[PDB]
Design an enzyme around this catalytic site. Structure first.
Site, PDB file in Angstrom:
ATOM      1  N   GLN A  13       0.822  -1.205   0.000  1.00 47.51           N
ATOM      2  CA  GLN A  13       0.000   0.000   0.000  1.00 47.51           C
ATOM      3  C   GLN A  13       0.860   1.261   0.000  1.00 47.51           C
ATOM      4  OE1 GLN A  13      -3.293  -0.442  -0.521  1.00 47.51           O
ATOM      5  NE2 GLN A  13      -2.697  -2.606  -0.531  1.00 47.51           N
ATOM      6  N   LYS A  14       1.913   1.278  -0.813  1.00 47.73           N
ATOM      7  CA  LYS A  14       2.815   2.417  -0.893  1.00 47.73           C
ATOM      8  C   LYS A  14       3.269   2.593  -2.334  1.00 47.73           C
ATOM      9  CE  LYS A  14       5.349   5.861   0.114  1.00 47.73           C
ATOM     10  NZ  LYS A  14       5.707   5.972  -1.327  1.00 47.73           N
TER      11      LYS A  14
END
Ligand code: GTP
Ligand code: MG
Lengths: 431, 73, 184
Positions: free
Chosen positions: C70-71
């Protein structure tokens, strides 16, 4: 035969090119069918410059129509003089650009550049002695701003020994209410500074102010400006289609009028300014027409040359006048001992006399000068560029496609350097 | 008044126009019964014409404004 | 014309889409995939890396792009050959610490534009457990009232009496098909 290929980009570019071809066809004596019907021998001695010879004495126009939207393509093809254009030179898309330089330069603008080159390469192969190219567009939308510069650089590389002249159109808030327009305009200027030999700035604000004051029009539409634009374009390209005492072409003109490669923005003019009505006041004389064409009121740009320094000036007369009268006028006006002396008219002016008068006017003068007053327009544009780059408004629209933030800063630095160079070169004497 | 009759007629016309504008601006320079004749003379005079014709008119204005007539050899 | 026109014609003909599915709960994604395929284990469990799968549902060629991390998710958001049409984010209801990062990622990913864009589908798994937030709390925390140009919708789910999930998935397809494709 020094042939010149013409290219049309954007809706404004296509319309201006169509009107220019319509104007020059009636002057050269070409009917809509394609044959010749003039009653003079001076109308065919240079017809091989902008036209091509075919079977049966045909004269196909040498123009290319390119767009990402087909509406303009259909409008012209079905025009009064659209049947003479070559159907193979119609390259258009569907989606368009939507007033975005990125969508027209890196995304949808690069998926048609190769197809466009096909037509160019193929059209330049039949030419015996190619001189250069030409492009008419505007710095407001996204198609003519991104795809235009792309094709310009393509011609510059594939053909680095030729000539490149553009007839850009400066947008104005009094006409268009678009917001990102200024950005796209700068991005186009950042490339036009490096990849252009000669530029003719046509300010829309000046034309609107002229139509709203001199001609007195309640609502000056697009045609009221397009008429003057086509008239000015027909007045400028007279030395390239008719001979005279000032024997020159495009290369000689670019060498004589452009001393510095970075400084090449000209300011056109035309006199008298008439609307689309088929009326006439009175046949103006030579001094009156000269004073009208040299005044700041008849300037196509919103810049006063009185506050700047003239670099290279060249005027082209059209009418039943003799070179002796023009020489006597230019010699008498530049005399301070006379009563008709003026200061707002320069001295170094290259005069020229043409025999064929314009359509509808018996006598008309065209003004071409390289005054250092375009810095005012460059500062007016930089004002809008800086009044929107501080808040970073509508900047993600360009970065979400593939553009970089450094391009805007580089364009701003180039514009500032150009303005500073113009301000430095404005002060120059010779004793 | 010395610039009113210059060698360049454009300078004469510009000086005349500027003097007319300044006389229309300031009203405490010339009196009420004198300014009318001055305006009538300055308006009905072609300063871009034979110097002999123009000069005679400038000597007139000087005499109308209380100014000594400047003369040359 | 060119490659883009042919790609658009193929997308309109074959009805191909691309749904970028994100999340880290590694528990709420199984049912989502099960809705796309009758299978239960094969091509149903999420992967740690990045996998591209193709399923058929309601006559739509869905191209699910399962991303585990999630980056820096902008690499999967855009592509020279195809863009993203749908976005489904799965978070935890009883977790208020890992919600700020998801909100920041959603704010940095979705941006304002002229016309419409991708459709968002916020999923809230595990609601019967103590500590789960309601729809209003999730809307106020993620600040979905300032996110324009992307129609969002919160769909709740739970291991027991989770009110199913058929409308939450049907609305996404109804909004996607009525945007690019034509009804008749
Ligand atoms: N003088 C003049 N300006 C025009 C004309 N048509 C458009 N413009 C100006 O051109 C700018 C808009 O550019 P467009 O010609 O719409 O550009 P485009 O590249 O075709 O457009 P997109 O593909 O939609 O980006 C504005 O400043 C308009 O006012 C015209 O016939 N004459
Ligand atoms: Mg357009």
């Amino acid at each position: 035969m020094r042939e010149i290929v013409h290219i049309q980009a954007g809706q404004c570019g296509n319309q201006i090119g169509a009107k220019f071809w319509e104007v020059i066809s009636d002057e050269h004596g070409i009917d809509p069918t394609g044959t010749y019907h003039g009653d003079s021998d001076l109308q065919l001695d240079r017809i091989s410059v902008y036209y091509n010879e075919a079977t049966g004495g045909k004269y196909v126009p040498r123009a290319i129509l390119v767009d990402l939207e087909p509406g303009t393509m259909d409008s012209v093809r079905s025009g009064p003089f659209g049947q003479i254009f070559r159907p193979d030179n119609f390259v258009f898309g569907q989606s368009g650009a939507g007033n975005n330089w990125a969508k027209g330069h890196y995304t949808e603008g690069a998926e048609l550049v190769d197809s466009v080159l096909d037509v160019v390469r193929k059209e330049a192969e039949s030419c015996d002695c190619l001189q250069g190219f030409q492009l008419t567009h505007s710095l407001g939308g996204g198609t003519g701003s991104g795809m235009g510069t792309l094709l310009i650089s393509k011609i510059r590389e594939e053909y680095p020994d030729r000539i490149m002249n553009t007839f850009s159109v400066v947008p104005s808030p009094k006409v268009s209410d678009t917001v990102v327009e200024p950005y796209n305009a700068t991005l186009s200027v950042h490339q036009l500074v490096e990849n252009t030999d000669e530029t003719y700035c046509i300010d829309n604000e000046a034309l609107y102010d002229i139509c709203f004051r001199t001609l007195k029009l309640t609502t000056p539409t697009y045609g009221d400006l397009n008429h003057l634009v086509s008239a000015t374009m027909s007045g400028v390209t007279t030395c390239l289609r008719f001979p005279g005492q000032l024997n020159a072409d495009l290369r000689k003109l670019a060498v004589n009028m452009v001393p510095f490669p970075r400084l090449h923005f000209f300011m056109p003019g035309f006199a008298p300014l008439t609307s689309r009505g088929s009326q006439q006041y009175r046949a103006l004389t030579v001094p009156e027409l000269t004073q009208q064409v040299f005044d700041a009121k008849n300037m196509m740009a919103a810049c006063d040359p009185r506050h700047g320094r003239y670099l290279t000036v060249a005027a082209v007369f059209r009418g039943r006048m003799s070179m002796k009268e023009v020489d006597e006028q230019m010699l008498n006006v530049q005399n301070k001992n006379s009563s008709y002396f003026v200061e707002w008219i320069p001295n170094n002016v290259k005069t020229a006399v043409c025999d064929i008068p314009p359509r509808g006017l018996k006598m008309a003068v065209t003004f071409i000068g390289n005054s250092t007053a375009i810095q005012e327009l460059f500062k007016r544009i930089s004002e809008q560029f800086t009044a929107m780059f501080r808040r970073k408004a509508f900047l993600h629209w360009y970065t979400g496609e593939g553009m970089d933030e450094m391009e805007f800063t580089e364009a701003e630095s180039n514009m500032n350097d150009l303005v500073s160079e113009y301000q430095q070169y404005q002060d120059a004497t010779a004793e | 008044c010395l610039l009113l009759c210059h060698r360049f007629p454009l300078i004469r016309k510009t000086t005349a126009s500027q003097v007319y504008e300044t006389l229309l601006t300031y009203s405490d320079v010339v009196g009420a019964d004198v300014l009318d004749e001055v305006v009538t003379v300055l308006s009905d005079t072609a300063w871009d014409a034979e110097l002999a014709v123009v000069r005679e008119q400038r000597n007139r204005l000087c005499d109308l404004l209380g100014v000594p007539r400047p003369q040359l050899v | 014309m060119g490659l883009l026109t042919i790609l658009k014609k193929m997308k309109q003909k074959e009805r191909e889409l691309r749904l970028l599915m994100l999340g880290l709960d590694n528990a709420g994604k199984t049912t989502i995939l099960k809705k796309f395929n009758g299978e239960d284990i094969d091509t149903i469990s999420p992967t740690l890396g990045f996998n591209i799968k193709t399923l058929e549902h309601r006559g739509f060629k869905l191209n699910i792009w399962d991303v585990g991390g999630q980056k820096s998710l902008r690499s999967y958001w855009r592509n020279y050959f195809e863009s993203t049409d749908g976005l489904i984010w799965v978070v935890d209801s009883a977790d208020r610490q890992r919600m700020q990062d998801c909100q920041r990622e959603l704010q940095s990913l979705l941006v304002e534009e002229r016309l419409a864009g991708a459709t968002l589908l916020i999923f809230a798994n595990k609601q019967d457990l103590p500590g789960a937030l309601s729809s209003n709390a999730i809307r106020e925390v993620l600040e979905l009232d300032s996110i324009r140009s992307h129609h969002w919708c919160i769909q709740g789910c739970s291991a027991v009496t989770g009110e199913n999930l058929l409308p939450g998935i049907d609305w996404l397809l109804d909004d996607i098909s009525s945007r690019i494709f034509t009804a008749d």
